[PDB]
């Protein structure tokens, strides 16, 4: 399908960067692509949240088709 | 299909960091899932690598 990731981030004094990711993707009505997209986005979520020197917030947006 | 993202990192400064990623996935015979997995990886990477406080090194493996 197709995917997009735009972000907002904020830097305050002595406070590690705060990051918000907006994840939008289309799975073209394919169940395997939907399962794989949710598993992969979640896998990226677990990797980025674990980073201790940055605060990560998420917004995921599924789209059936273009 | 299932997917997995291994990760590591190291300190460059107290603001700049180096993030390493290893993405593994399967597409379950679905062409749409395969391209979607790759577009998702490219989107995350381009977004993270555009952050001035992050440098990204990554590899992708199919299973």
Author numbering:
A (entry chain A): 3 to 68
B (entry chain B): 3 to 65
Question: Which of the paper's sentences describe this entry?
Answer:
Here we use deep network hallucination to generate a wide range of symmetric protein homo-oligomers given only a specification of the number of protomers and the protomer length. Starting from only a choice of chain length L and oligomer valency N (2 for a dimer, 3 for a trimer, etc.), the method carries out a Monte Carlo search in sequence space starting from a random sequence. The loss function guiding the search is computed by inputting N copies of the sequence into the AlphaFold2 (AF2) network, and combining structure prediction confidence metrics (pLDDT; per-residue structural accuracy, and pTM; an estimate of the TM-score) with a measure of cyclic symmetry (the standard deviation of the distances between the center of mass of adjacent protomers within the predicted structure). To eliminate such over-fitting, we generated new sequences for the HAL backbones using the recently developed ProteinMPNN sequence design neural network (accompanying manuscript: Dauparas et al.).
To evaluate design accuracy we attempted crystallization of 19 designs and succeeded in solving crystal structures for seven (three C2s, two C3s and two C4s). All crystal structures had the correct oligomerization state and closely matched the design models (median Cα RMSD of 0.6 Å across all designs, with resolutions ranging from 1.8 to 3.4 Å). The side chain conformations in the crystal structures also closely match those of the design models. HALC2_062 is a three-layer homo-dimer with a single helix from each protomer packed together between two outer β-sheets (one from each protomer), while HALC2_065 is also a mixed α/β homo-dimer, but has a single, continuous β-sheet shared between both chains, which wraps around two perpendicular paired helices. These two hallucinated structures are distinct from any structure in the PDB, with TM-scores to their best matches of 0.59 and 0.54 respectively.
